[PDB]
Amino acid sequence: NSFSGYLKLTDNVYIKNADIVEEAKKVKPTVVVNAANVYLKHGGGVAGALNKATNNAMQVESDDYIATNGPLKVGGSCVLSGHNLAKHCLHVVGPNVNKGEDIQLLKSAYENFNQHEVLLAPLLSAGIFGADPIHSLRVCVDTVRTNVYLAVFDKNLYDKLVSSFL
Q: Does 14 bind ligand A1CMB (CB under 6 A)?
A: no
For the bound state, the minimum distance from the C-beta of residue 21 to ligand A1CMB, rounded and expressed in Å, comes to 4
- Nearest residue (CB) to ligand A1CMB, 71 versus 130: 130
**CB neighbourhood size of 117 (10 A):** 12
Among positions 3, 138, 147, 154, the unique one binding ligand A1CMB when judged by CB under 6 A: 154
For residue 131, the 8-state DSSP code is -
Q: Does 157 bind ligand A1CMB (CB under 6 A)?
A: yes
Q: Does 45 bind ligand A1CMB (CB under 6 A)?
A: yes
**CA gap 49, 93 in Å, rounded:** 16
- Nearest residue (CB) to ligand A1CMB, 5 versus 68: 5
**CB neighbourhood size of 104 (10 A):** 10
Among positions 13, 27, 46, 92, the unique one binding ligand A1CMB when judged by CB under 6 A: 46
Q: Does 27 bind ligand A1CMB (CB under 6 A)?
A: no
81 contacts: CB under 8 Å, gap ≥ 6: 57, 58, 61, 88, 89
Total residue length of the chain = 166
For the bound state, the minimum distance from the C-beta of residue 71 to ligand A1CMB, rounded and expressed in Å, comes to 22
CA of residue 61 relative to chain centroid, distance: 18
**CA gap 103, 106 in Å, rounded:** 6
Name the residue type at position 9.
L
- Nearest residue (CB) to ligand A1CMB, 15 versus 31: 15
- Give the residues lining the site for ligand A1CMB (CB under 6 A): 19-21, 45-46, 49, 122, 126-127, 152-154, 157
